[PDB]
Design an enzyme around this catalytic site. Sequence first.
Site, PDB file in Angstrom:
ATOM      1  N   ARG F 102       0.540  -0.874   0.146  1.00 59.15           N
ATOM      2  CA  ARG F 102       0.342   0.012   0.189  1.00 59.15           C
ATOM      3  C   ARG F 102       1.074   0.939  -0.081  1.00 59.15           C
ATOM      4  O   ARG F 102       0.988   1.882  -1.152  1.00 59.15           O
ATOM      5  CB  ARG F 102      -0.930  -0.080   1.351  1.00 59.15           C
ATOM      6  CG  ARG F 102      -1.639   1.197   0.813  1.00 59.15           C
ATOM      7  CD  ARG F 102      -2.345   1.899   0.690  1.00 59.15           C
ATOM      8  NE  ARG F 102      -3.062   0.873  -0.832  1.00 59.15           N
ATOM      9  CZ  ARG F 102      -3.312   1.070  -2.097  1.00 59.15           C
ATOM     10  NH1 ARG F 102      -2.857   2.166  -2.451  1.00 59.15           N
ATOM     11  NH2 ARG F 102      -3.913   0.521  -2.637  1.00 59.15           N
ATOM     12  N   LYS F 137       2.812  25.469  -4.956  1.00 57.62           N
ATOM     13  CA  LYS F 137       1.585  25.773  -4.819  1.00 57.62           C
ATOM     14  C   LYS F 137       2.301  23.446  -4.980  1.00 57.62           C
ATOM     15  O   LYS F 137       1.767  22.871  -5.968  1.00 57.62           O
ATOM     16  CB  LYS F 137       0.837  25.838  -5.923  1.00 57.62           C
ATOM     17  CG  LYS F 137      -0.231  27.232  -6.227  1.00 57.62           C
ATOM     18  CD  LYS F 137      -1.409  27.609  -5.956  1.00 57.62           C
ATOM     19  CE  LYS F 137      -1.636  28.473  -5.927  1.00 57.62           C
ATOM     20  NZ  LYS F 137      -0.897  29.637  -7.647  1.00 57.62           N
ATOM     21  N   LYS F 169       6.062  39.542  -6.520  1.00 60.13           N
ATOM     22  CA  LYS F 169       4.813  40.366  -6.136  1.00 60.13           C
ATOM     23  C   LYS F 169       4.113  41.583  -6.567  1.00 60.13           C
ATOM     24  O   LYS F 169       5.238  42.602  -6.367  1.00 60.13           O
ATOM     25  CB  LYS F 169       5.019  39.033  -5.158  1.00 60.13           C
ATOM     26  CG  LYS F 169       3.852  37.657  -5.261  1.00 60.13           C
ATOM     27  CD  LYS F 169       3.471  36.543  -4.227  1.00 60.13           C
ATOM     28  CE  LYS F 169       3.704  35.565  -4.949  1.00 60.13           C
ATOM     29  NZ  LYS F 169       3.482  34.889  -3.870  1.00 60.13           N
ATOM     30  N   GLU F 199       6.778  40.702 -10.803  1.00 58.52           N
ATOM     31  CA  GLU F 199       5.465  39.875 -11.520  1.00 58.52           C
ATOM     32  C   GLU F 199       4.623  41.138 -12.158  1.00 58.52           C
ATOM     33  O   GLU F 199       4.547  42.871 -11.474  1.00 58.52           O
ATOM     34  CB  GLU F 199       3.944  39.504 -10.122  1.00 58.52           C
ATOM     35  CG  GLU F 199       3.871  38.115 -10.637  1.00 58.52           C
ATOM     36  CD  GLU F 199       2.716  37.336  -9.515  1.00 58.52           C
ATOM     37  OE1 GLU F 199       1.749  38.297  -8.985  1.00 58.52           O
ATOM     38  OE2 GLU F 199       2.984  36.908  -8.654  1.00 58.52           O
ATOM     39  N   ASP F 220       1.198  38.802 -15.778  1.00 65.01           N
ATOM     40  CA  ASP F 220       0.295  38.808 -14.657  1.00 65.01           C
ATOM     41  C   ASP F 220      -0.513  38.017 -15.546  1.00 65.01           C
ATOM     42  O   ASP F 220      -1.919  39.393 -15.057  1.00 65.01           O
ATOM     43  CB  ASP F 220       0.672  38.706 -13.205  1.00 65.01           C
ATOM     44  CG  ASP F 220      -0.924  38.284 -12.596  1.00 65.01           C
ATOM     45  OD1 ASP F 220      -0.597  36.762 -11.998  1.00 65.01           O
ATOM     46  OD2 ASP F 220      -1.396  38.904 -11.880  1.00 65.01           O
TER      47      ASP F 220
END
Lengths: 284, 280, 280, 284, 285, 285
Positions: F102, F137, F169, F199, F220
């Site tokens: 598993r 992410k 950013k 960005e 962006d």
Amino acid sequence: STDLTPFQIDDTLKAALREDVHSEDYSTNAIFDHHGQAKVSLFAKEAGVLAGLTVFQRVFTLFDAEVTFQNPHQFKDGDRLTSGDLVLEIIGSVRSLLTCERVALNFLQHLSGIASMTAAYVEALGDDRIKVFDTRKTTPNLRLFEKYAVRVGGGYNHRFNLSDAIMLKDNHIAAVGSVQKAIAQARAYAPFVKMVEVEVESLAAAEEAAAAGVDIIMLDNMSLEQIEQAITLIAGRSRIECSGNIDMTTISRFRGLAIDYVSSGSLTHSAKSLDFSMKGLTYL
Amino acid sequence: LTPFQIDDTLKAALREDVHSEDYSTNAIFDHHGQAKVSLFAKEAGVLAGLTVFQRVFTLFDAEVTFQNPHQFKDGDRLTSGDLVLEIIGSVRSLLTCERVALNFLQHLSGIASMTAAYVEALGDDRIKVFDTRKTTPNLRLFEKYAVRVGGGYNHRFNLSDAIMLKDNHIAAVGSVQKAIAQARAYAPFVKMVEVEVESLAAAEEAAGVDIIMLDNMSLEQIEQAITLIAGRSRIECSGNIDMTTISRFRGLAIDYVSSGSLTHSAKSLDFSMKGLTYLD
Amino acid sequence: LTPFQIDDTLKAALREDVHSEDYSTNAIFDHHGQAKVSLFAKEAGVLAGLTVFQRVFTLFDAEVTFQNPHQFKDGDRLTSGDLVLEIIGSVRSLLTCERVALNFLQHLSGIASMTAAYVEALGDDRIKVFDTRKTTPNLRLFEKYAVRVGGGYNHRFNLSDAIMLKDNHIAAVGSVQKAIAQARAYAPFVKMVEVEVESLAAAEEAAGVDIIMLDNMSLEQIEQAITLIAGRSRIECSGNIDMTTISRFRGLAIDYVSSGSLTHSAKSLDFSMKGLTYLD
Amino acid sequence: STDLTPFQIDDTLKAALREDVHSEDYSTNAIFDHHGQAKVSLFAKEAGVLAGLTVFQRVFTLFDAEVTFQNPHQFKDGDRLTSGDLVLEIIGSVRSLLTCERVALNFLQHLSGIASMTAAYVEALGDDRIKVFDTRKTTPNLRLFEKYAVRVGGGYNHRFNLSDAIMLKDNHIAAVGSVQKAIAQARAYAPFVKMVEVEVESLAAAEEAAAAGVDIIMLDNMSLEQIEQAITLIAGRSRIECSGNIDMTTISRFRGLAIDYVSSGSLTHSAKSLDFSMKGLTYL
Amino acid sequence: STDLTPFQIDDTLKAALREDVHSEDYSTNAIFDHHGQAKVSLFAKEAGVLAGLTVFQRVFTLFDAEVTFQNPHQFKDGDRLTSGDLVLEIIGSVRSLLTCERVALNFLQHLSGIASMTAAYVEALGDDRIKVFDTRKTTPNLRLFEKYAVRVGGGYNHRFNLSDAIMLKDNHIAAVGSVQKAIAQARAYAPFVKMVEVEVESLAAAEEAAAAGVDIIMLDNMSLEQIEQAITLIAGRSRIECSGNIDMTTISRFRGLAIDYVSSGSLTHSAKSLDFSMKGLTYLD
Amino acid sequence: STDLTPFQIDDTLKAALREDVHSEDYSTNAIFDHHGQAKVSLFAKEAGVLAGLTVFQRVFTLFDAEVTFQNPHQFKDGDRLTSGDLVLEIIGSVRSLLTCERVALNFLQHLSGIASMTAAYVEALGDDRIKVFDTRKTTPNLRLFEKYAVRVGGGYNHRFNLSDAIMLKDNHIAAVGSVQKAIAQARAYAPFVKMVEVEVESLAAAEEAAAAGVDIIMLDNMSLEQIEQAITLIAGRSRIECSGNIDMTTISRFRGLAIDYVSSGSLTHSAKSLDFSMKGLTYLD
């Protein structure tokens, strides 16, 4: 008949060696500059049951991989001992033998103690339809080992931790107020995958608990008259367990009842450790 | 005991007992407030590792607190039915780590109690009761503290503390005079040197070593060997020591007896956590 | 040094140096076979922690191996251009953990070298050169081993080894006779007792303590204090000790001088890993 | 002007205390049964730069939370010191002060040493268009701290580990054979997010490396005649770094060149530690 | 259900922060001083179910204890979301907010995803006598969390690991040969404390298994005609579970049966994560 | 690309095994002796890309060193799969196979999922001058692995953490006010060793950013008309990256532009895991 894997135990022993040997073994290293191969005999110096022999061996091999082991009598864990028995012979570097001897013995002594004690209870109980379980009352960070010693000794193992089963102690019931309500609430939380045991110190509450259909009922410190009453009152809707004041000499009262298992703390927490002896060192 | 010393041990003991979550407890979690629980001693003995008991709760849940009505401290004596501690906090925080704390408290208070029994049973208080490295593994730090608490004293903590020369070591060099010289050569002036000795003749040949250990000698022999040592070193007795036996040494001019059983063969004391109720 | 002792330190040192992956190395990974790399000493000195160097490679990659053509061992002397080790294995395994290993080897071989310089500079070999707890933190175990390798000896490892009574401690009890008695009371016969002393008068009042430390005393005074101690205890000198200075003690009946700088102010030795080539 | 968070360093110090205090401070605990509040003064006993003062303080607070700190001169890291300066006063339980004093000093001494040494190099260099960087040559498991000491001292920090940038040493090039081929291969592997530095011990290879458009070129141990040649040969297609045999007394040769930074090992690995002094203990 | 204790999760989150911040946050520390304090708003950018909000908060507090949280709408785990919703406001040092934002959002997004997906299955099933369980098919070293998300989402939990219950797969039975004998042998090994589930791909074997009185019978990928037969054949002696080929769109076939629970992998292993965002940074007072 | 070293992954896998096996495998140990040895076949049950096969193998060897592996088709990571394919055969003690099966499948399934999904985006994009990058992410404490799966799948890697590169950013710029000043200030803080990405949500600011010579400019969520304008306005002084609203079906709009790479979250955080299975257990000789 199931040993312990090295993966399970290697991390624990390593700490036990670091514990016993902060810098070096001065006493040993002063006298044996030789790294000369020697043999040492592990003697049992007391009657009982052998447990954690593989653990004993693993301690040596973690200190020094080149250490080896003759076992003339094919002794294994669970085998019975007597004073003056040659369990193991241990061959390797002299320092490797004299240094991690104490640490290995500590495990062997401690585990073989638990196993021995379990075996005494099992034989003392006499009824073998009734089983002898243990608890989480254990010396901390050694639960894995202590539970293995109980298996070895003829006993069985109760839930390992809080995540295994749902056991509702007297506190828990006091906190919800009802038993019927406490159990329903447990069953709601974990619906089908968890066994549900309940501690009960009155005949009345055992009725109520068997009604709400619990898996195990634990009769906490009840009398023989009451246990018999409660078995037929449960009417086999649940398992019965007995507990409390179960010592070496008490346990025999349960012989012949239709309970399923008694269980005891002392097995793990109050076990006199068995004795072994390190002697017969000679070069080879 | 400092928290830094013990924290990492206790944290593993909690992870041990709570692999996924406390289903039994969490199933009953409510919207209720904090609760109080009373720690009762259910047996006669000596209290040890009360701070350890408390640290277990605070590591699980920082917001847990402690009333102590009788100002009970480690080393204080117990008897059945005594209210040692009251424990206040979240209900899950109390019911979950109760077992783990009790395991330490029970276990340590056992050792301390047993030490105290040997100390009182010995009777002579010029003679001291020491312990050993015979200990349950990875709890040596704690078990030695319990022996202090119980009236005892501590021997070397590990193999790196002192130089103790057992009978094997001497057999290997052949001589005792030569074995000791060889130890003292190896380490600097900073290490004590103890010698195990099972004959009057070899005890003479020792004394300047720091400690001489009379391994399992008779009362006639111990009394001979003390005057034969003539106070050139410390005398320690060992072997064949049990609660009943220890009393023989009463009145001798030995410095300390020492025992294993204190650490390795100690019945643990009993406590219990009864009397849960919600606070208002 | 046993692997058990050191493994957990080295593993953290590798995780330190390799947080994600070795991009620089992995970008050049090929289909090639194993390679050999030569460890050259690029400076004169003493070799220390060669086993540690090797253990770093084997912890990253077990399949790595080591030719040692000149049978170089720790404590052996070096000079520039010496082939200490050849290292064989996967190319990424060599190029990645090379820095971490060199850092230990360089650092330890530095200490050892410096110790050896002090020992040779002292000249008297009845007098020994000890170290201290002045060490770079979380590497005390290693640094003390380097001092052994370099000809030196080891003082107490931590505060729990021996009882050393500094000038503060004495000031606090007021008396020296009383301070020592109080130490000896607290611990059992098993702990050595050293005393720091900055006056001839107080050195008299000491000697039975195990070691007396003459803290920064003059040559005239040291010679007076030795005969004043009259060999009832060990004499240690300290303070104002540098490579140049240490030579004064040559010929005295002190037992050992001791120094910090050995551990805390040690120029590290130089090595390098040149001579990478693929094996056939 | 950026300190260290407790979260970053707390785990490391705790081990340093456990290191220095296996069981208890017998010497201290024998004499001071009192837990009596006292004040102690931290004196600098040498000229240099202060670094890791917060670290010094954190050591005390981890042993004993109830310890506190007067700072009369508002001393901060990066501030310059001189012999006989009162940096800190330390107030709390007598045992708490006398026990973890050594451990705290060890950090303070060690870090303030690195910082001091960096500052010496920076001032000794003289050119302030040219910067002084450090390396991964560091004492192990303290890289975080040592790199902070370099910042404090006027220096700057090179990649922290192997995962930060792609630096191609002489081994790496020898292993692919070509430089043009080695760089292309690195750029393939990590396309745009990683800086690419190359070590180069010949004018010829620096041409070839600047051609394939690398971010930084490192002139490893080249002569002054050659560095000047190589700067105009690079023709500003890449950054230039110098290295090797950069000691206290050498560094000044670079003054006035159009290199971008020199870098040095010694800053981290061969730093004499600064001296501090613990005295003036008195009750309060 | 109930939240996660800090003690349970702290070690996992601490590693996730060390993961994302090996040296320091250069991007953040270059632009912002340690002195300044600010507020930031957590917005849900997608419709779904909220899960692991306490986890989100615990990430910030582990980095920086002096961080605090306004919650204007009293949003809690299990509450439903829609795009644009102000879930949390987060107040503290600017660096402390901008640095561990990503790590927190990762947990919140991931968990709220699982919960949301569970809830979709539960509503899609329609029958609420029938329950939706999960499995050990989970992303590794996050099983604790993922199982909590399933609870939050309306689902329930199966055995956590191999040591929880005794589940006898088709291999296990093949190996002893009999089912009656396999079960007896399991019950012998762990006597009273372990539940016993049995996988069964034939009506015949489900009879034999219910006979030997097992706790749960798992009907592995059986047809609707067969399930309806097997329920009455079990005759309620044991629990029935269904499994296999249970996706978003299939699950509805079980509606109206007297099975006890269906169970699914995808809930844990194949869950689209929900979207949130941290916009609306501004300095306080 | 290249595999994962054991040293990198061992600690993660060891915790995953301790997770799944807290006490012992009762179900397995009840039915099978320690003595017997067997072979088991790993079958792919779904079409996709193989990833983390070495990881699969390392899980077995950490539990039991004496386990071994036949690979008849020389399958490696990055190789394409289809249903029914015999990827591996696994030989060793029966318990050792049935217990850690598993845990291994969980890694293999999860990683092979990411890889597969990446590959879908890459093929769906069509332009191969344009590259497909990933993000932070990621599901927490598995970033190392997930980034390897993206490599395997045809993709590339962005900065691993906050300490890798300097990414500025829109908040960061707002905070200094200017872009020209923000960048200068970043470059000042970490002088030569750190890449600098910016960005930018407006053509005007992309001009100013390319002027101050930044390494990467991130467009962006800009429109196709605007991207085409901004590329010539940048005039190749910096790299162009596109982002936002990049799903399976959108990505194809970028085909033919002179951007350098698009980048996506979903690859890591919203990846359906691939299916495998371990069937075909039989005892050897």
